[PDB]
Design a protein around this motif. Structure first.
Motif, PDB file in Angstrom:
ATOM      1  N   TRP A  14       0.782  -1.198   0.000  1.00  0.00           N
ATOM      2  CA  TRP A  14       0.000   0.000   0.000  1.00  0.00           C
ATOM      3  C   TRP A  14       0.829   1.269   0.000  1.00  0.00           C
ATOM      4  O   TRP A  14       0.331   2.278  -0.450  1.00  0.00           O
ATOM      5  CB  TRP A  14      -0.974  -0.013   1.157  1.00  0.00           C
ATOM      6  CG  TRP A  14      -2.133  -0.984   0.989  1.00  0.00           C
ATOM      7  CD1 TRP A  14      -2.222  -2.004   0.089  1.00  0.00           C
ATOM      8  CD2 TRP A  14      -3.335  -1.043   1.779  1.00  0.00           C
ATOM      9  NE1 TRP A  14      -3.411  -2.678   0.251  1.00  0.00           N
ATOM     10  CE2 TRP A  14      -4.113  -2.104   1.275  1.00  0.00           C
ATOM     11  CE3 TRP A  14      -3.826  -0.291   2.846  1.00  0.00           C
ATOM     12  CZ2 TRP A  14      -5.368  -2.431   1.800  1.00  0.00           C
ATOM     13  CZ3 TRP A  14      -5.065  -0.626   3.379  1.00  0.00           C
ATOM     14  CH2 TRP A  14      -5.816  -1.689   2.851  1.00  0.00           C
ATOM     15  N   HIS A  86      -7.764   5.595   2.378  1.00  0.00           N
ATOM     16  CA  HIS A  86      -8.254   6.482   1.320  1.00  0.00           C
ATOM     17  C   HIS A  86      -8.380   7.941   1.756  1.00  0.00           C
ATOM     18  O   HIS A  86      -8.503   8.821   0.909  1.00  0.00           O
ATOM     19  CB  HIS A  86      -9.587   5.975   0.782  1.00  0.00           C
ATOM     20  CG  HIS A  86      -9.534   4.516   0.436  1.00  0.00           C
ATOM     21  ND1 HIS A  86      -8.771   4.037  -0.607  1.00  0.00           N
ATOM     22  CD2 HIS A  86      -9.997   3.431   1.086  1.00  0.00           C
ATOM     23  CE1 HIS A  86      -8.796   2.717  -0.592  1.00  0.00           C
ATOM     24  NE2 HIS A  86      -9.550   2.317   0.423  1.00  0.00           N
ATOM     25  N   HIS A 222      -8.649   0.505  -4.869  1.00  0.00           N
ATOM     26  CA  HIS A 222      -7.464  -0.340  -4.869  1.00  0.00           C
ATOM     27  C   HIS A 222      -7.323  -0.870  -6.285  1.00  0.00           C
ATOM     28  O   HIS A 222      -8.330  -1.227  -6.911  1.00  0.00           O
ATOM     29  CB  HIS A 222      -7.605  -1.494  -3.858  1.00  0.00           C
ATOM     30  CG  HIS A 222      -7.653  -1.038  -2.437  1.00  0.00           C
ATOM     31  ND1 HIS A 222      -6.534  -0.686  -1.707  1.00  0.00           N
ATOM     32  CD2 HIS A 222      -8.696  -0.876  -1.599  1.00  0.00           C
ATOM     33  CE1 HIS A 222      -6.904  -0.330  -0.483  1.00  0.00           C
ATOM     34  NE2 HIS A 222      -8.212  -0.435  -0.391  1.00  0.00           N
TER      35      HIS A 222
END
Ligand SMILES: [Zn+2]
Ligand SMILES: [Zn+2]
Ligand SMILES: [Zn+2]
Length: 274
Positions: A14, A86, A222
């Motif tokens: 990530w 996010h 994603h």
């Protein structure tokens, strides 16, 4: 699922770099290898679609600049859903730019509190709190300059999860894009002490809604939602844009619904006293 594993993954793929690129027409990818972030270029400035983990805001700002954009030209920030992976850069970017934040009404308390619903004391899921300037519901339209997006209420993964629809050009022709908000179970509790009231009903309404929508280009928060990396590899001057796959949201929502049933059964079995 464990929160430890969520964080482990969140602090690895990530946060890893991915080269930014023009995805289709005025939509540009500026996210990481594991979290998708987009710039939408309009005649009156930039729309930023999501951010990434709190620690990754500098990387996102760097990717924006790599494409020749100015962070200062961001006028609106839109959110798909209010989880830290996010929302981590919203407070920072809003302060730096003076942009307005637009998000689903039922996510407003999450954004404004900087916490995970149903796990509000968990500091490793917290993020910097940010004020919502416009709270949206199903069908609301958001315009900057020449560009308009339509909000769709697609709750489940969060209570205010909002999927955003917009039209782009592919040559002479219109194509409809959905920034799908997420439909994974992930860390949510479905039964026992559900993460929020009505969560199960929300997910199943969302899977059905997704299968019925007429969408040419599936995007999401994603890259795994839409197989981003594989599509980027197939981009070539003069060849068809590989992000146009009009049956993909039906296929993806079906995979989500099947996993939802598995997770609901698992959590239901786990509630049994042992
Ligand atoms: Zn999420
Ligand atoms: Zn996420
Ligand atoms: Zn809708």
């Amino acid at each position: 699922q464990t929160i430890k594993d969520f964080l482990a993954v969140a602090m690895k793929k990530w946060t890893a770099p991915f080269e930014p690129f023009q995805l289709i027409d005025n939509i540009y990818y500026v996210g990481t290898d594991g979290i998708a972030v987009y710039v939408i270029k309009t005649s009156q400035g930039l729309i930023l679609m999501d951010t990434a983990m709190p620690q990754s805001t500098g990387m996102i700002k760097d990717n924006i600049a790599k494409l020749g954009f100015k962070v200062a030209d961001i006028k609106l920030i839109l959110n798909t859903h209010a989880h830290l992976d996010h929302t981590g850069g919203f407070a920072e970017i809003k302060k730096e730019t003076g942009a307005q934040l637009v998000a689903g009404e039922r996510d407003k308390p999450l954004l404004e509190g900087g916490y995970y619903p149903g796990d509000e004391k968990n500091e490793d899921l917290a993020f910097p709190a940010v004020k919502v300037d416009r709270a949206v519901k199903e069908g609301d339209r958001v315009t900057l300059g020449d560009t308009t997006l339509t909000a769709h209420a697609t709750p489940g993964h969060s209570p205010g999860c909002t999927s955003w629809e917009m039209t782009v050009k592919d040559g002479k022709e219109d194509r409809e894009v959905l920034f799908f908000c997420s439909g994974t179970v992930a860390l949510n509790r479905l039964v026992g002490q559900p993460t929020y009231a009505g969560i199960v009903d929300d997910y199943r309404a969302t899977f059905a809604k997704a299968k019925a929508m007429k969408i040419d280009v599936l995007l999401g928060p994603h890259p795994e939602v839409y197989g981003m990396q594989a599509k980027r590899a197939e981009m070539k001057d003069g060849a068809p844009n590989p992000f146009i796959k009009p049956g993909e949201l039906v296929t993806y929502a079906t995979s989500l619904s099947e996993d939802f049933d598995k997770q609901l059964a698992k959590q239901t079995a786990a509630l049994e006293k042992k």
